[PDB]
Amino acid sequence: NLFQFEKLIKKMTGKSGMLWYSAYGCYCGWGGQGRPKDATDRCCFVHDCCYGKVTGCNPKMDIYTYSVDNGNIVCGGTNPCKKQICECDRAAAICFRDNLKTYDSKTYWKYPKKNCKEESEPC
């Protein structure tokens, strides 16, 4: 669930998802269209693609099982659909950390989703 997502982002990034990643580029946060603007924005696009594939559970609302083992986030439990969610979340948290070096709030924070009106990329 979203509470969990925030936890993983904080863990991997040191940053709050709600502050840093809820309104960045064309895809990070609520809504998303057009093409991702940067590496970070791409992490978000892929996240949305990742949720889009989840069938038989709710990737925003359901609670998945995870443990932190020597810095690593391991996706457990026995429900395959919940594990899928865990996998989506963790993959976006790792993708934000890989890309912290090009994170640009000055250009991309509060980007007007209106400037995202050109041929979308397929998942």
Curated annotation (Swiss-Prot):
Write down the Pfam families for this protein, in alphabetical order: Phospholip_A2_1
Full protein name = Basic phospholipase A2 APP-D49
Write down the PANTHER family for this protein, in alphabetical order: PHOSPHOLIPASE A2 FAMILY MEMBER, PHOSPHOLIPASE A2, MEMBRANE ASSOCIATED
PTM annotation, UniProt: Acylation causes dimerization.
Q: What is the lineage of its organism?
A: Eukaryota, Metazoa, Chordata, Craniata, Vertebrata
Q: Localized where?
A: Secreted
The listed outcome for residue 10 to E is:
95% decrease in catalytic efficiency. 500-fold decrease in catalytic efficiency
- CDD domains given for it? PLA2c
From what organism does this protein derive? Answer: Agkistrodon piscivorus piscivorus (Eastern cottonmouth)
Q: Which reaction does it catalyse?
A: a 1,2-diacyl-sn-glycero-3-phosphocholine + H2O = a 1-acyl-sn-glycero-3-phosphocholine + a fatty acid + H(+)
